[PDB]
């Protein structure tokens, strides 16, 4: 099987560097080097993310889409930056304006064809394609607009292969941009109707989870990114490993989406202990479920405790008892019968790889489909209206060839999306 990552925008890009920083080491691939793999198993399934050309050069099969040179020229001028074949860099030296409209209708719409071109060169690579990984932020141009287009096109070209989306939904407390809800509401819209698996991460849900669950005092972006990339590795790549009970994107999809919206999840990693001290090793297993299922530790902003779950997928990856795994999951399902929805006898989807995260003994990625994420699109949707009402920075959109009915559309859509999700919380 296979997949082809997609680094839309700067963020989605910045993260690319971290997702590939990791993944590679979790596959023994040095900058341009080959497979130094401490083992022999980190190779029989690599294909999922690379391509064979030289014999020591397995190149990441991702796409780097962005209308701001400097960015990709920071990712390509640093560490692992020199492993991507230049063909991968689909830049847009234009003005990468922070407008969803500027990267979806006017500026991005041009650079698109020169992207799809490659997304096809990579898809028609070899063997059988599974789906595409998509990273980006719903709070900018090259991210929400242009990346949200990249998919609307992808999903027309292969409505068969899957589409996981890793979105950095606009954090609450403080917005790292101003129109944010504009660029956001507009991209979520496109998401709820193309990709079929979305993993929403919040820069501040991370800080928290990174400053209190990792006594880490100076959580640089690199970190946040790093933590995130840690989860997306547990998801995909991982399951493309052996296991007593292994799954793969689809299983994950076909066990997690009760209703076609596409629904968005909230990823959570397992061993998340501070370096030295904490290295408690309390990782027998009840310790991992202890972790994963708590409020804090959910990369999302919202707290599960604020709304039932529809599905859950503990994708563990480290030798354990299909008994102490299958078992724990249960008590968990009974101690919290309250929030776990009922019309699904077994919400949880236990998954079990074998080999764990390179240096760790036992981990377990969590992919939750809780109704709690209602209380986020609400947020976003609110911010919109409060500012849409006055058409705040709307001239930067319309003036870019947009529509007063376009914004209406998205909000509503994504706004209805909130509605539905409640239809199950009840």
């Amino acid at each position: 099987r296979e997949i082809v990552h997609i680094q839309a925008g700067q963020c989605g890009n910045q993260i690319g560097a971290k997702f590939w920083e990791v993944i590679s080491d979790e596959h023994g691939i040095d900058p341009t080097g080959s497979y130094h793999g401490d083992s022999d198993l980190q190779l029989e399934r690599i294909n999922v993310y690379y391509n064979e050309a030289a014999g020591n050069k397995y190149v990441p099969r991702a796409i780097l889409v962005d209308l701001e040179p400097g960015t990709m020229d920071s990712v390509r001028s640093g560490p692992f930056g020199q492993i991507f074949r230049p063909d991968n860099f689909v830049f847009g030296q234009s003005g990468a304006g922070n407008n969803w409209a500027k990267g979806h209708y006017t500026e991005g719409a041009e650079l698109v064809d020169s992207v799809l071109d490659v997304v096809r060169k990579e898809s028609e690579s070899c063997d059988c394609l599974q789906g595409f990984q998509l990273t980006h932020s719903l709070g900018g141009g090259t991210g929400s607009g242009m990346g949200t287009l990249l998919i609307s096109k992808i999903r027309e070209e292969y409505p068969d292969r899957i589409m996981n989306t890793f979105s950095v939904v606009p954090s609450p407390k403080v917005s790292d941009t101003v129109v944010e809800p504009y660029n956001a509401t507009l991209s979520v819209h496109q998401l709820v109707e193309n990709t079929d698996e979305t993993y929403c991460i919040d820069n501040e849900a991370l800080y928290d989870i990174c400053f209190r669950t990792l006594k880490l005092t100076t959580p640089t972006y690199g970190d946040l990114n790093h933590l995130v990339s840690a989860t997306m590795s547990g998801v995909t790549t991982c399951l493309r490993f052996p296991g007593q009970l292994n799954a793969d994107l689809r299983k994950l999809a076909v066990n997690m989406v009760p209703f076609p919206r596409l629904h968005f999840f909230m990823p959570g990693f397992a061993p998340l202990t501070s370096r030295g001290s904490q290295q408690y090793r309390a990782l027998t297993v009840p310790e991992l479920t202890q972790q994963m299922f708590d409020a804090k530790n959910m990369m999302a902003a919202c707290d599960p405790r604020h709304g039932r779950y529809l599905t859950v997928a503990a994708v563990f990856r480290g030798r354990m008892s299909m008994k102490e795994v299958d078992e724990q999951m249960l008590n968990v399902q009974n101690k919290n019968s309250s929030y776990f929805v009922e019309w699904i006898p077994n919400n949880v989807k236990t998954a079990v790889c074998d080999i764990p995260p390179r240096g760790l003994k036992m981990s377990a990625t969590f992919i939750g489909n809780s109704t709690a994420i209602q209380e986020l699109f609400k947020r976003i949707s609110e911010q919109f209206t409060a500012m849409f009402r006055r058409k705040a920075f709307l001239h930067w959109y319309t003036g870019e060839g947009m529509d007063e009915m376009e914004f209406t559309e998205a909000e509503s859509n994504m706004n209805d999306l909130v509605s539905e999700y409640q239809q199950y919380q009840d």
Binding site: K251, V254, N255, P258, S321, K323, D326, W343, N346
Partner: protein
């Protein structure tokens, strides 16, 4: 004379590797000896690969190891219809290529895991295509039906109400071994909170050895496969008896091993030792096939059983005077060199049809409704070549399996 076997679904394959292990182990045929007599099916390569990478690697022909690199999918539909379809032909081919090579066979011991994708669906049509290609044989399917409270898949029932209705009109005798109710045995009758799947497998891997292996093996009271279905099913419904083993004592802890027949037989009817959470809560037995093995005096049996026939609290069906098929083998059991199984010199693998499953089916049917009642993961099957028909019409199916297992008993 023989009995092919088709281990379907990762599980049916894990259990397969196990039952297949115990075999050579008690036949003096190490890693590389003769040639098996079965096949392995799965739509997830990595698992059958375990039989291609791990132990008992070269004891098989890459020909009796079928795989569909594609996708497993914990959903009946996909495994039965859509995907599972593509492989079936090929699958059959082996059970027609392996079925030919032999000499007057008796049937195919099928190994599947009720609530899976490749295990429920696929087989459904495998057994399906068999009942037509060899209606003139035995179709005893050895299942591992849904843990009463400790299920795994979220959908499980969808997959098990569907493997039951499609296989029902195709099997001869369906043996059942409850995954959870076996754990109890590992907790209560062997002591270990560390039971790896690799153990439950060693267990069924035992009870099964008592079925085929030893039985198809000479003895003082041989019992053919046909024998079963005949002495075991009162009615065409591919009736599902339950597997039970007697000396399930721990090879470390306690040691009273020397537990003469009179004991090991009584240890079969106590509900805490039957590889099935169908505690004889009321279910009247209607036929039991007491397969003994090891040093056993026919009188010992034709007495130990007599004592039972008159315990009454063990109430047998009405329309059934005597329902006790005494199967005596010679060679005692054969425990793994160093697993956790005691290792006695006599055992009782008694299986039977009990009005008890009236429960187990009930409790599993109800499950289904709850979800269907909301369509839950329905879109996952529909989009896989199924319809509101197959579900609703397979529900009605089992409905008359709740009435069937009710009528054939509870009444006189």
């Amino acid at each position: 004379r023989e009995c092919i076997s088709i281990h379907v679904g990762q599980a049916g394959v894990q259990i397969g590797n196990a039952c297949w292990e115990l075999y050579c182990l008690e036949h003096g045929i190490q890693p590389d000896g003769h040639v098996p007599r079965a096949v392995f099916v799965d739509l997830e390569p990595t698992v059958i690969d375990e039989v291609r990478t791990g132990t008992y690697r070269q004891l098989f022909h890459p020909e009796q190891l079928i795989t569909g690199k594609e996708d497993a999918a914990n959903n009946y539909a996909r495994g039965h219809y859509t995907i599972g379809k593509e492989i079936i032909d090929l699958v059959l081919d082996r059970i027609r290529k392996l079925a030919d090579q032999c000499t007057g066979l008796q049937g195919f011991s099928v190994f599947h895991s009720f609530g899976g994708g490749t295990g429920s669906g696929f087989t459904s049509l495998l057994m399906e295509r068999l009942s037509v290609d060899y209606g003139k044989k035995s179709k005893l399917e050895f299942s591992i039906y849904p843990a009463p409270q400790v299920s795994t898949a979220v959908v499980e029932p969808y997959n098990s109400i569907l493997t039951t209705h499609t296989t029902l009109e195709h099997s001869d005798c369906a043996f059942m071994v409850d995954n959870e109710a076996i754990y109890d045995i590992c907790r209560r009758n062997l002591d270990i909170e560390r039971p790896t799947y690799t153990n439950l497998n060693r267990l069924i891997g035992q009870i099964v050895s008592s079925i085929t292996a030893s039985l198809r093996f000479d003895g003082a009271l041989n019992v053919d496969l046909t024998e079963f279905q005949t002495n075991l099913v009162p009615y065409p419904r591919g009736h599902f008896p339950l597997a039970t083993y007697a000396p399930v004592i721990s090879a470390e802890k306690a040691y009273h091993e020397q537990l003469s027949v009179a004991e090991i037989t009584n240890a079969c009817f106590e509900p805490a030792n039957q590889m099935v959470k169908c505690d004889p809560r009321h279910g009247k037995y209607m036929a039991c096939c007491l397969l003994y093995r090891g040093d056993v005096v026919p009188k010992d049996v034709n007495a130990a059983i007599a004592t039972i026939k008159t315990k009454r609290t063990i109430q047998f069906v009405d329309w059934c005077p005597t329902g006790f098929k005494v199967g005596i083998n010679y060679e005692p059991p054969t425990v793994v060199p160093g697993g956790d199984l005691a290792k006695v010199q006599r055992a009782v693998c008694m299986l039977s049809n009990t009005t008890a499953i009236a429960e187990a089916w009930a409790r599993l049917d109800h499950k289904f409704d709850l979800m269907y009642a909301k369509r839950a993961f329905v879109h996952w099957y529909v989009g896989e070549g199924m319809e509101e028909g197959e579900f609703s019409e397979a529900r009605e199916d089992m409905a008359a399996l709740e009435k069937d297992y009710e009528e054939v008993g509870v009444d006189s």
